[PDB]
Short mmCIF file of C-alpha atoms and ligand atoms in Angstrom, two decimals:
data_model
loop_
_atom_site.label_atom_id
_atom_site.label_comp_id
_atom_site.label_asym_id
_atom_site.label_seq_id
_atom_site.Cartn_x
_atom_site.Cartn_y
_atom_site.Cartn_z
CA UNK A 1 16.48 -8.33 35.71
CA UNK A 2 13.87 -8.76 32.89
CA UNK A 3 11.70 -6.52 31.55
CA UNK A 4 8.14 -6.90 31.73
CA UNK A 5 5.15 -4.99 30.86
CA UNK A 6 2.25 -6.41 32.73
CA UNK A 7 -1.31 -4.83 30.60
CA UNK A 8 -3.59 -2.99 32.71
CA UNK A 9 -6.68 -1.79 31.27
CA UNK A 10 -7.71 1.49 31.33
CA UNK A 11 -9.91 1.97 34.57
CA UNK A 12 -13.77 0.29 34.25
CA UNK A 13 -13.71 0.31 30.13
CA UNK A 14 -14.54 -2.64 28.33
CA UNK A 15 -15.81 -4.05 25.16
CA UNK A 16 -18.30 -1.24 24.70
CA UNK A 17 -15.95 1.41 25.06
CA UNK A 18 -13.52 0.20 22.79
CA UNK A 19 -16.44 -0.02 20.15
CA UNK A 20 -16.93 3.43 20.48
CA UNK A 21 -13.39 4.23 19.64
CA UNK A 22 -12.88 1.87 16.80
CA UNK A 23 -16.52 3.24 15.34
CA UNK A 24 -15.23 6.87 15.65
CA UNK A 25 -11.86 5.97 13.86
CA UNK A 26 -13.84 4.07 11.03
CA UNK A 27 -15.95 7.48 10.82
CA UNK A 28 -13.06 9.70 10.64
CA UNK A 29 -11.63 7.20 7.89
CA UNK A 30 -14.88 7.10 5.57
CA UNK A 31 -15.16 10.83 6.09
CA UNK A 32 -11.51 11.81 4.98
CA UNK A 33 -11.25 10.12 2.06
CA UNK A 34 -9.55 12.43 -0.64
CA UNK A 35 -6.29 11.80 1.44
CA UNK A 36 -2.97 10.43 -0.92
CA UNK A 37 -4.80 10.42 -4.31
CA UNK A 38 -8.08 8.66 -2.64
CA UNK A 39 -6.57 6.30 -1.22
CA UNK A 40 -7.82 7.13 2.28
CA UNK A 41 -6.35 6.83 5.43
CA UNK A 42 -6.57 3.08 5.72
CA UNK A 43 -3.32 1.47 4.84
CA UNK A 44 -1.46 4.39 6.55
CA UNK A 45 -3.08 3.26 9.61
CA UNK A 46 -2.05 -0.09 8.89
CA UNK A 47 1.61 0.53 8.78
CA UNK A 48 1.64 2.97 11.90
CA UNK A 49 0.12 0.03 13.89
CA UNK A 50 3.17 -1.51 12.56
CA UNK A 51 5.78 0.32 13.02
CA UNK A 52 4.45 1.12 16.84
CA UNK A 53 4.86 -2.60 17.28
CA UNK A 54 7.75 -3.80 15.30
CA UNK A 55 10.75 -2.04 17.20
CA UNK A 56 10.52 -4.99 19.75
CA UNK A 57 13.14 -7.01 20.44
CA UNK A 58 11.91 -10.60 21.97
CA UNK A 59 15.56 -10.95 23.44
CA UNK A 60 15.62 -8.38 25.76
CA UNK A 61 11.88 -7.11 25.75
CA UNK A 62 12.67 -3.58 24.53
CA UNK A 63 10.54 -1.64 22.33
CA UNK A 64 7.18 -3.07 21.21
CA UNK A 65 3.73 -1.76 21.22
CA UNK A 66 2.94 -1.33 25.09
CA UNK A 67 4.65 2.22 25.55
CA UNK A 68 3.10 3.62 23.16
CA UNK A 69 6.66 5.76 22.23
CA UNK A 70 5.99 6.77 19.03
CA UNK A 71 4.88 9.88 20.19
CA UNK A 72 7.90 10.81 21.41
CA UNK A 73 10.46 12.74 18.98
CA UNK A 74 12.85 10.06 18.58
CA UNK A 75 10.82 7.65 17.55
CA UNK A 76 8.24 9.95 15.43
CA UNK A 77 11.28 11.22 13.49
CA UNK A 78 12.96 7.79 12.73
CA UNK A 79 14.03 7.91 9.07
CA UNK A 80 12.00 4.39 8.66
CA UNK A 81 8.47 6.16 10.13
CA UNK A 82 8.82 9.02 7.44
CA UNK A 83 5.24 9.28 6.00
CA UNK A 84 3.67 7.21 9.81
CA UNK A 85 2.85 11.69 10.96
CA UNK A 86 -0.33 11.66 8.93
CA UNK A 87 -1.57 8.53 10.68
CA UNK A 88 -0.41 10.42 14.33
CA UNK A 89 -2.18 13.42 13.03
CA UNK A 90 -5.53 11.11 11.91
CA UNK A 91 -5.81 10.11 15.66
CA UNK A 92 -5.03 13.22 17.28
CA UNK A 93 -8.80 14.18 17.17
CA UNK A 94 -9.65 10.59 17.96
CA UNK A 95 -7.24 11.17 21.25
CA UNK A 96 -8.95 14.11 21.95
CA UNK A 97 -12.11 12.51 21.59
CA UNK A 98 -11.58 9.62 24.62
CA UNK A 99 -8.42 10.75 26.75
CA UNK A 100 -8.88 7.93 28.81
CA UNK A 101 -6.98 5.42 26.24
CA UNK A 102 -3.30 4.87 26.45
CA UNK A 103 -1.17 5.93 23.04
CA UNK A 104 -0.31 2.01 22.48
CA UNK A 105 -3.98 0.95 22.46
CA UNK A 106 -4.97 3.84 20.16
CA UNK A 107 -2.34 2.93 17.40
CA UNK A 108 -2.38 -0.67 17.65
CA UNK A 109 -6.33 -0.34 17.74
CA UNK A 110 -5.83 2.33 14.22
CA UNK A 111 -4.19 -0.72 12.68
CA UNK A 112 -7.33 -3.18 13.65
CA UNK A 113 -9.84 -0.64 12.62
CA UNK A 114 -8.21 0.03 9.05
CA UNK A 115 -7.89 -3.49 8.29
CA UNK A 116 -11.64 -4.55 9.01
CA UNK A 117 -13.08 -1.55 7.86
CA UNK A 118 -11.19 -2.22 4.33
CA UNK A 119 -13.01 -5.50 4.32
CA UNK A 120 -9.92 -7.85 6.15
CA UNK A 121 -10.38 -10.43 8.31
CA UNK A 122 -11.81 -9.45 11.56
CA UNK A 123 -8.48 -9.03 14.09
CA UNK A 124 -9.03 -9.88 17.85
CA UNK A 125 -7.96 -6.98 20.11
CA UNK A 126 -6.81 -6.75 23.47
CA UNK A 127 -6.82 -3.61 25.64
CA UNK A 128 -4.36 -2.86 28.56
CA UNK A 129 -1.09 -1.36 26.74
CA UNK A 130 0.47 1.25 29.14
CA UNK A 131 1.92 4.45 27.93
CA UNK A 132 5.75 4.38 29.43
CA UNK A 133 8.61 7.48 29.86
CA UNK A 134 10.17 9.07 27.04
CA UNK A 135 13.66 7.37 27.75
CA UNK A 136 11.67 4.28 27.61
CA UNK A 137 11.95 4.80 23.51
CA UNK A 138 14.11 2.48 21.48
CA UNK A 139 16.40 3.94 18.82
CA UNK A 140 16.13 4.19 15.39
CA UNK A 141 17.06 1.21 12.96
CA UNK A 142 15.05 -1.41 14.82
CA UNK A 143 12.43 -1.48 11.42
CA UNK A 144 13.33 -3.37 8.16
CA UNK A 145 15.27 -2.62 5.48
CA UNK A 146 13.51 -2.88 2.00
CA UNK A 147 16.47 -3.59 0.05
CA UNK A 148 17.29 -6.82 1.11
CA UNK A 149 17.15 -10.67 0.13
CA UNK A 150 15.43 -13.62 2.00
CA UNK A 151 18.10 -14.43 4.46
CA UNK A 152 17.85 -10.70 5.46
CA UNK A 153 13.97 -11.14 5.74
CA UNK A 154 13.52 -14.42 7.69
CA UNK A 155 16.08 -13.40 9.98
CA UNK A 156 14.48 -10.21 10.46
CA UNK A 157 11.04 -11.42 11.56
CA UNK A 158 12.95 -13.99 14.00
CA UNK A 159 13.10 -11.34 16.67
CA UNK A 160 9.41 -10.33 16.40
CA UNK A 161 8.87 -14.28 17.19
CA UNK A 162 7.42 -14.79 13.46
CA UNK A 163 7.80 -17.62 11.44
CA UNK A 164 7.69 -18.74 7.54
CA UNK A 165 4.24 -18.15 7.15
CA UNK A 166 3.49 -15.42 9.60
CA UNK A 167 6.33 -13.56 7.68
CA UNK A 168 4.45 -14.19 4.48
CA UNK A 169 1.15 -13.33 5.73
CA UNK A 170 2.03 -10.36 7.17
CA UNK A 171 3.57 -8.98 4.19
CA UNK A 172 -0.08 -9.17 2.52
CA UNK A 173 -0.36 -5.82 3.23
CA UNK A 174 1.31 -4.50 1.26
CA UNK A 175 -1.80 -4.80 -1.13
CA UNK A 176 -2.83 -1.89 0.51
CA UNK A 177 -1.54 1.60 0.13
CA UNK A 178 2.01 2.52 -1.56
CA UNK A 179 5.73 3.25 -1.67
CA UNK A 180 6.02 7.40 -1.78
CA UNK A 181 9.29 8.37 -3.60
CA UNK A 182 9.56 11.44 -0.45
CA UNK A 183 9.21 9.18 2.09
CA UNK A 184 11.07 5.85 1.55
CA UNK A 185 13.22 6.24 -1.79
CA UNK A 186 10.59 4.07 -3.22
CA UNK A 187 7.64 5.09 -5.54
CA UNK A 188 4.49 3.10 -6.86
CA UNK A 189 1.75 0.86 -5.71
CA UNK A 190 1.71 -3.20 -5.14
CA UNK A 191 -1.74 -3.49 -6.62
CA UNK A 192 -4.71 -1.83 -8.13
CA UNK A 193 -7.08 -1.94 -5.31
CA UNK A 194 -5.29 0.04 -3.06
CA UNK A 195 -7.76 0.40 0.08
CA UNK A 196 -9.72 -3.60 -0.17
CA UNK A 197 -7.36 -5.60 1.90
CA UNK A 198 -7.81 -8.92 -0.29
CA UNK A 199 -4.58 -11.28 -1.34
CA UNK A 200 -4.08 -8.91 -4.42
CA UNK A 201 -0.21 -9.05 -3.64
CA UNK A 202 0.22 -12.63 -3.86
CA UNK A 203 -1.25 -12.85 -7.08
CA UNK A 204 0.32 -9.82 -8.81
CA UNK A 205 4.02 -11.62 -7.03
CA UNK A 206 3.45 -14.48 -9.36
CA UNK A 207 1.47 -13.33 -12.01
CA UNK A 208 2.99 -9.91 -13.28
CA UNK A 209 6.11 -9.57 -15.60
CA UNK A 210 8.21 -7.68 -13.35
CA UNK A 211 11.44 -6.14 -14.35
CA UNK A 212 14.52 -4.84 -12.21
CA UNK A 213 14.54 -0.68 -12.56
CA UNK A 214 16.43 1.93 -10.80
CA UNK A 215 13.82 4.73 -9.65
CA UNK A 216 14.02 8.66 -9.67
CA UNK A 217 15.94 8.01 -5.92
CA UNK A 218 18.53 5.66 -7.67
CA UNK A 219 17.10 2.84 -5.60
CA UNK A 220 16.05 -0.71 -7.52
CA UNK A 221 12.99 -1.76 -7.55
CA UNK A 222 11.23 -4.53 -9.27
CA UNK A 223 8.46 -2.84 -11.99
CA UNK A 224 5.41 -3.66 -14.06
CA UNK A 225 4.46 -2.41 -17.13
CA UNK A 226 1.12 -2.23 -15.45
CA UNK A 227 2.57 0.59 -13.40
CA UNK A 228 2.97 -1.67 -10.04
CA UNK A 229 6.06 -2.28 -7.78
CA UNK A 230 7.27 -4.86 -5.54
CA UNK A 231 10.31 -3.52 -3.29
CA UNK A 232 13.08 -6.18 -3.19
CA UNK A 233 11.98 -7.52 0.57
CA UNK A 234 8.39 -8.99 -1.37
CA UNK A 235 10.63 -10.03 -4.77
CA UNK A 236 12.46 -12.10 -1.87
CA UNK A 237 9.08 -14.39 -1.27
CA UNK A 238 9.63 -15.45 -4.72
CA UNK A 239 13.22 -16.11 -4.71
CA UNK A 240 12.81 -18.11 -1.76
CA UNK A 241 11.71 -21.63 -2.26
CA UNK A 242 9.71 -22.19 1.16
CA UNK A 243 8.75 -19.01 1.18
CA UNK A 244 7.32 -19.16 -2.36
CA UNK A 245 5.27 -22.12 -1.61
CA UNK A 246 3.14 -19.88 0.93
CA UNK A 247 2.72 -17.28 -1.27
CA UNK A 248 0.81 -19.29 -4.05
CA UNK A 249 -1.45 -20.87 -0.71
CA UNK A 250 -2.39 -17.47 0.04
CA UNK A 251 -2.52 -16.00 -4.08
CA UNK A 252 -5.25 -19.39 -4.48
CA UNK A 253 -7.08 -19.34 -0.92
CA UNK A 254 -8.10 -15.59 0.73
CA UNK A 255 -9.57 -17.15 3.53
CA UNK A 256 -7.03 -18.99 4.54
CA UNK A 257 -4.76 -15.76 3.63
CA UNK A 258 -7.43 -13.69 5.73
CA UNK A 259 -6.92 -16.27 9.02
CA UNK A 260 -3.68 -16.54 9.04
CA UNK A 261 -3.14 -12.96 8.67
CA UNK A 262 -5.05 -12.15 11.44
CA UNK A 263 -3.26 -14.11 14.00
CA UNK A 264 -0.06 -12.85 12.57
CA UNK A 265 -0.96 -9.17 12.82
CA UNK A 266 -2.76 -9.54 16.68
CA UNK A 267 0.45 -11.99 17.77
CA UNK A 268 2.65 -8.78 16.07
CA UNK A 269 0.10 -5.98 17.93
CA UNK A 270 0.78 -8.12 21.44
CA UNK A 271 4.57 -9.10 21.34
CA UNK A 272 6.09 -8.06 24.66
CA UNK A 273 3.03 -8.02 26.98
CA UNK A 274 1.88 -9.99 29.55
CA UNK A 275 -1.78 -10.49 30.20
CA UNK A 276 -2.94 -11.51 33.46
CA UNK A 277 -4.94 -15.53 33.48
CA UNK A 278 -7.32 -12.72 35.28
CA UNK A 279 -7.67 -10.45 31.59
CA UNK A 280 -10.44 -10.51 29.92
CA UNK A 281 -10.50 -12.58 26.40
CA UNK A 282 -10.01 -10.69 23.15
CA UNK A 283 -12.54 -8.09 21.71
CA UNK A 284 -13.49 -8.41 17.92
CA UNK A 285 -15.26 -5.03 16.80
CA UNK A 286 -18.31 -5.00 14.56
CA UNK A 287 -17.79 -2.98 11.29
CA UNK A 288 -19.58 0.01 10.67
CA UNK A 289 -21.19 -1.95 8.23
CA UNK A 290 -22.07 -4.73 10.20
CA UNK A 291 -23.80 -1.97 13.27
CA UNK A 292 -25.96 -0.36 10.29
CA UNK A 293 -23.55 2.87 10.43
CA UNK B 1 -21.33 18.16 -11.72
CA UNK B 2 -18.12 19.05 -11.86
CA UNK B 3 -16.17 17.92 -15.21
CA UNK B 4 -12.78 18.61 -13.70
CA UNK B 5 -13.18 17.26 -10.56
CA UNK B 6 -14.46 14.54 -11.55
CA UNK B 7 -11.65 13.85 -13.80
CA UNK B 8 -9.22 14.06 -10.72
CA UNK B 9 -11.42 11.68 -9.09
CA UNK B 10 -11.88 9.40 -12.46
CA UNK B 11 -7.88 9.67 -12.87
CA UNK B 12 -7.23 8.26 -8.89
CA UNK B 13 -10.17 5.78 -8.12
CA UNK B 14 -10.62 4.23 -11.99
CA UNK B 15 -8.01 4.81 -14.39
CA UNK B 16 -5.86 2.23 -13.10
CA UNK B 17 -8.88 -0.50 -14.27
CA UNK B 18 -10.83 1.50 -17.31
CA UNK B 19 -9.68 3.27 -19.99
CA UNK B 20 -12.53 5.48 -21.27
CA UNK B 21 -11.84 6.41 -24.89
CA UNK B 22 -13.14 5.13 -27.99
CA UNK B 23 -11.15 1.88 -28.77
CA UNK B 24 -9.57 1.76 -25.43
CA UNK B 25 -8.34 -1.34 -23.99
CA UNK B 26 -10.13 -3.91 -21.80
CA UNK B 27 -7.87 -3.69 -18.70
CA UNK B 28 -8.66 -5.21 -15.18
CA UNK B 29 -11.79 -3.80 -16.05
CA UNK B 30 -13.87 -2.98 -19.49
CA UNK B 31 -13.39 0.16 -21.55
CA UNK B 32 -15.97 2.70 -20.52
CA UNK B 33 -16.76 4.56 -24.06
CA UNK B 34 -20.47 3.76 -24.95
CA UNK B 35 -21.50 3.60 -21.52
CA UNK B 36 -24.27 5.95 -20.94
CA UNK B 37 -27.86 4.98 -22.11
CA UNK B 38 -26.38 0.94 -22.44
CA UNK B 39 -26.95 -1.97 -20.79
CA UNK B 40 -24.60 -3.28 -18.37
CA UNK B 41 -22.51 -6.18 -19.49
CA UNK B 42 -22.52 -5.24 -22.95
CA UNK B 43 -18.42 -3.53 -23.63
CA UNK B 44 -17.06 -5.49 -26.60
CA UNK B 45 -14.54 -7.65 -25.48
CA UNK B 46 -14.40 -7.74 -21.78
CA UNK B 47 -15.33 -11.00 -19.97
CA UNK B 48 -18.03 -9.98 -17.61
CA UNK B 49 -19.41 -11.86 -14.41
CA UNK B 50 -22.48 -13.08 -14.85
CA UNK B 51 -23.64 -10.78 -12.10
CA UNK B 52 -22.98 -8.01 -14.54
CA UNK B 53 -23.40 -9.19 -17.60
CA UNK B 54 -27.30 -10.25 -16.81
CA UNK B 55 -28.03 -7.25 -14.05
CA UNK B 56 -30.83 -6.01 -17.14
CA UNK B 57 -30.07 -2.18 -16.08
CA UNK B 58 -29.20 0.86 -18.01
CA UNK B 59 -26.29 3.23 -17.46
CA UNK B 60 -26.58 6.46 -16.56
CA UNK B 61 -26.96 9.92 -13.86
CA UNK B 62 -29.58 7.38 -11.68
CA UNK B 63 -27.93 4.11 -11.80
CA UNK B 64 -24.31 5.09 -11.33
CA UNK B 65 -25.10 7.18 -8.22
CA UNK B 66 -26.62 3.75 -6.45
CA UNK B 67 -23.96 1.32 -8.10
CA UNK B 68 -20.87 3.62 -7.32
CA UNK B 69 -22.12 4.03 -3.88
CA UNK B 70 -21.36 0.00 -2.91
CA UNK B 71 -20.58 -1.78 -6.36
CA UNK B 72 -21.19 -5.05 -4.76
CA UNK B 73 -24.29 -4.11 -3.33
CA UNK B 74 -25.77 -3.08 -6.06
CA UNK B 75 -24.43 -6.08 -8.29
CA UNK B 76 -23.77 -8.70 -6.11
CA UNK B 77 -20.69 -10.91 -6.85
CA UNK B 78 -19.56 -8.30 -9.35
CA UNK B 79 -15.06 -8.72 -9.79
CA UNK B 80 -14.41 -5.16 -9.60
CA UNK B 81 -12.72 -4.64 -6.06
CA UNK B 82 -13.89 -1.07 -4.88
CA UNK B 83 -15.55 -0.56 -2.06
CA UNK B 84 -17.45 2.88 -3.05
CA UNK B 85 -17.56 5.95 -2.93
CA UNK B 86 -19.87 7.45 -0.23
CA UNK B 87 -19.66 11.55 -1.17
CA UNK B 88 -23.21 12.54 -3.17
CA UNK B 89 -21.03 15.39 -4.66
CA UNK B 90 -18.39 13.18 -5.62
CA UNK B 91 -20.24 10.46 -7.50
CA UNK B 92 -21.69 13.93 -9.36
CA UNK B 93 -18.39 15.04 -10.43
CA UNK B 94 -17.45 11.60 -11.65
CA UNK B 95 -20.84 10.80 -13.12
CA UNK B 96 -20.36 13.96 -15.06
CA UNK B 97 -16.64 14.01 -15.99
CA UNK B 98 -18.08 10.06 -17.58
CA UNK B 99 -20.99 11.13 -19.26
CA UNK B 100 -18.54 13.62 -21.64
CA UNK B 101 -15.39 11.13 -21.77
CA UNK B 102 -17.22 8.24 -22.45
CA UNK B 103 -19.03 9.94 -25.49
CA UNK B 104 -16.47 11.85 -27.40
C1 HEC C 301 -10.00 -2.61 -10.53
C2 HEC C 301 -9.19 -2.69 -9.25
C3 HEC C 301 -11.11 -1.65 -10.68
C4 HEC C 301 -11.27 -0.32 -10.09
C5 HEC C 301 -10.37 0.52 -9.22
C6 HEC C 301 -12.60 0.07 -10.63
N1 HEC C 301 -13.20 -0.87 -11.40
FE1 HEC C 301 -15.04 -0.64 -12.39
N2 HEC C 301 -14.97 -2.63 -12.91
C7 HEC C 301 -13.93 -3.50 -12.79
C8 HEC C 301 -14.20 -4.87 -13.28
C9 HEC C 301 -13.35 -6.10 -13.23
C10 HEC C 301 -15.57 -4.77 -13.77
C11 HEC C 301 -16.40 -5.91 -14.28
C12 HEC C 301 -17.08 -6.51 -13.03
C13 HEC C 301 -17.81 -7.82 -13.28
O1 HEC C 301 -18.33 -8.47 -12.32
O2 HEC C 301 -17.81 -8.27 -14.43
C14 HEC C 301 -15.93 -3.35 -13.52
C15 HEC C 301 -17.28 -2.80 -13.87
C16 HEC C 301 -17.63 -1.37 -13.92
C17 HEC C 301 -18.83 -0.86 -14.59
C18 HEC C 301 -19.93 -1.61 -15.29
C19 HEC C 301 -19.48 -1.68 -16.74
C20 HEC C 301 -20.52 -2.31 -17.68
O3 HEC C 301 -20.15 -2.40 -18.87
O4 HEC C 301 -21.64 -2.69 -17.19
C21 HEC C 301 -18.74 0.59 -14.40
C22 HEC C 301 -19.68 1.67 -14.86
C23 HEC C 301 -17.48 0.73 -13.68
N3 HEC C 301 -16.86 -0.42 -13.39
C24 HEC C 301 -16.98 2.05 -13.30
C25 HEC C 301 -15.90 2.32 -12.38
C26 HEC C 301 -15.70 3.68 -11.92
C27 HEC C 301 -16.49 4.87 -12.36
C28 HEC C 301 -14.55 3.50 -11.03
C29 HEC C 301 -13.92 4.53 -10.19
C30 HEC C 301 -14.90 5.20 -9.29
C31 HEC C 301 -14.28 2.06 -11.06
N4 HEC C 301 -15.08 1.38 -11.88
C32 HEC C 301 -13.16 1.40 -10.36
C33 HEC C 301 -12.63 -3.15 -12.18
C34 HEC C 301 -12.35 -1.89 -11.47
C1 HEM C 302 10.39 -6.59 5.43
C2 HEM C 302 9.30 -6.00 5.89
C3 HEM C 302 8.80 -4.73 5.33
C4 HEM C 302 9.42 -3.75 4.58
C5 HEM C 302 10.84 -3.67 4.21
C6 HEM C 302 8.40 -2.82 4.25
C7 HEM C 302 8.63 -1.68 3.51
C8 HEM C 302 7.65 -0.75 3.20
C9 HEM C 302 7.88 0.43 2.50
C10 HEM C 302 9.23 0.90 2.02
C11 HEM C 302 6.69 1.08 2.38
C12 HEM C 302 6.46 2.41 1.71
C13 HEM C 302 6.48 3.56 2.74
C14 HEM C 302 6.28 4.90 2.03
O1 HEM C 302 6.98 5.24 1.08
O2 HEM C 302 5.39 5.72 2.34
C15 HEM C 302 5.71 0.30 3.00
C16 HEM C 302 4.38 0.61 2.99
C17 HEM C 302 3.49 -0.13 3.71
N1 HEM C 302 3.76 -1.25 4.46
FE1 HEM C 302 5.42 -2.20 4.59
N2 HEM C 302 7.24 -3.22 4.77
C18 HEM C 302 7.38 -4.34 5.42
C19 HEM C 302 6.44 -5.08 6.14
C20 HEM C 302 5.14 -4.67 6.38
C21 HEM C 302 4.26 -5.25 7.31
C22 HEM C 302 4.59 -6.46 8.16
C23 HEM C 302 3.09 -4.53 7.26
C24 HEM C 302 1.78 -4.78 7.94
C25 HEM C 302 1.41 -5.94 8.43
C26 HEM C 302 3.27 -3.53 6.26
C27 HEM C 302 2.32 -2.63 5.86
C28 HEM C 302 2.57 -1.56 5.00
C29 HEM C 302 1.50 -0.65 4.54
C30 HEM C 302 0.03 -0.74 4.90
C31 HEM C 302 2.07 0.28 3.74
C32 HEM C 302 1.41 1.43 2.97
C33 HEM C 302 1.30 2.72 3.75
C34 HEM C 302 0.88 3.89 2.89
O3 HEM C 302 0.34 3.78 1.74
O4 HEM C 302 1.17 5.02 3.37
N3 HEM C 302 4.53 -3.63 5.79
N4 HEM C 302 6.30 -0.87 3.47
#
């Protein structure tokens, strides 16, 4: 009896439409920028476009980012989300703003807007994600646990259908944004550059002293007396020997960091749907920057 | 501008790169003190771009409010990774929390 979720875009919008909404999220997100210290909303984005789409499960098709579920209680108060309600609360006006577009496309779409507009690779976007019922919402524990080896890790991203290096790639960023002691049990940054979306992980991975510390929630994390953290999930692409191999590709070659990343993060915003032969191709957005805005 | 403001915004967008005291370490970026009224490219110590070290302008209220703007548009191929800030009354706080901490 498999589950499918066929996409179905939202009645006689297309590409221009969607520009509209990704130009008044990258508005919103130049405008508020005192948020967390001046870091902005960006990486917050990021990781709620995440965590939308990372509760699926490829072996029975449950979760994912077609429902759109996070906004249902359940989901929105999942221990692992703590910190994702200021991202929810960014795109309530943005809701508001076009209540024609299904929850799924808006967060998924957050993610993609966050990630060019910090000067990423450009991410190809598809529309179509339905909103579905709220017993349609998969339980807490589906996300990853930070304290964890390599073996816990590549495991992991086997059922989100990810591989060696879209596992590695993916975990790029984490250059943006950090770990808030109140929300994870984890406190400090992965980098300097906190809202540029460059390979700035992979390079402070292999080229900062780091040292094993418990922090003020008795957790371990790996530290640098340049004030930066790696949890023990991105210590793990070090440990690991094919895993460490990627990590000095990407730490020597952005662009290469930048395509592969992009693939990984659309393959991760599209896990679980079907699109019609019929569907049209993926949308890539123009910047703000790039329409003169 | 606002000294104290622009402290809070010096402390959150900058520190983490510049130091901005007399004798202050080069970091990611160079030490700040002296900055005001000097040519870029010129803190002792730091390895510059050449973008910066040869952009032939002068520090101060007028040419931090363009550079801090869009770094990279104003010195293209600069290494500092910041992608601006876009507030007028922002860059006034910071521009005049720098003009006192880089000259005491
Ligand atoms: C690291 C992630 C940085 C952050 C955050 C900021 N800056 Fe920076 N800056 C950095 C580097 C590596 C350099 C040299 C760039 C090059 O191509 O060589 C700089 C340069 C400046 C300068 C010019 C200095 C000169 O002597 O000509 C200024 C005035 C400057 N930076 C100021 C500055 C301010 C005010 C910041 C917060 C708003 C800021 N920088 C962030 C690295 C980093
Ligand atoms: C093993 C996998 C992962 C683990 C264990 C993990 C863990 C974490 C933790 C603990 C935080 C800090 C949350 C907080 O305290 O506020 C975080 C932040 C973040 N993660 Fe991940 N992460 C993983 C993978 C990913 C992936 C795949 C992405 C995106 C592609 C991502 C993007 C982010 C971003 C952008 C932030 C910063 C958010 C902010 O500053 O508020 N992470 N991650």
């Amino acid at each position: 009896k498999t589950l499918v979720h066929v996409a179905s875009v939202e009645k006689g919008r297309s590409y221009e439409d969607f520009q509209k909404v990704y130009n008044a999220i990258a508005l919103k997100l130049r405008e508020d920028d005192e948020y967390d210290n001046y870091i902005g909303y960006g990486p917050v984005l990021v990781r709620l476009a995440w965590h939308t789409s990372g509760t699926w499960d490829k072996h029975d098709n449950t979760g994912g980012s077609y429902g759109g579920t996070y906004r249902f209680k359940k989901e929105f108060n999942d221990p692992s989300n703590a910190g994702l309600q200021n991202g929810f609360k960014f795109l309530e006006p943005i809701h508001k703003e076009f209540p024609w577009i299904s929850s799924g496309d808006l967060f998924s779409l957050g993610g993609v807007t966050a990630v060019q507009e910090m000067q990423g690779p450009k991410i190809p976007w598809r529309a179509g994600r339905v909103d579905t019922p709220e017993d349609t919402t998969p339980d807490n524990g589906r996300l990853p646990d930070a304290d964890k080896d390599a073996d816990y890790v590549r495991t992991f991203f086997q059922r989100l259908n990810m591989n060696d290096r879209e596992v590695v790639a993916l975990m790029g960023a984490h250059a943006l944004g950090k770990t808030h002691l109140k929300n994870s049990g984890y406190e400090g940054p992965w980098g300097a550059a906190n809202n540029v979306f460059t390979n700035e992980f992979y390079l402070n991975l292999l080229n900062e002293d780091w040292k094993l510390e418990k922090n003020d929630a008795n957790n371990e994390q790996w530290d640098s007396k340049s004030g930066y953290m790696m949890l023990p999930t991105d210590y793990s692409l070090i440990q690991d020997p094919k895993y460490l191999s990627i990590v000095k590709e990407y730490a020597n070659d952005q662009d290469k960091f930048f395509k592969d990343f992009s693939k990984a993060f659309e393959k991760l915003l599209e896990n679980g749907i079907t699109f019609p032969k019929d569907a049209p191709s993926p949308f890539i957005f123009k910047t703000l920057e790039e329409q003169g805005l | 501008g606002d000294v104290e403001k622009g402290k809070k915004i010096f402390v959150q967008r900058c520190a983490q790169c510049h130091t901005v005291e007399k004798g202050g370490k080069n970091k990611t970026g160079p030490n700040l003190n002296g900055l005001f009224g000097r040519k870029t490219g010129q803190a002792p110590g730091f390895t510059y771009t050449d973008a910066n070290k040869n952009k032939g302008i002068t520090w101060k209220e007028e040419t931090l409010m363009e550079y801090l703007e869009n770094p990279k548009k104003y010195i293209p191929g600069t290494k500092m990774i910041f992608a601006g800030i876009k507030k007028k009354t922002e860059r006034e706080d910071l521009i005049a929390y720098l003009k006192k901490a880089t000259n005491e």
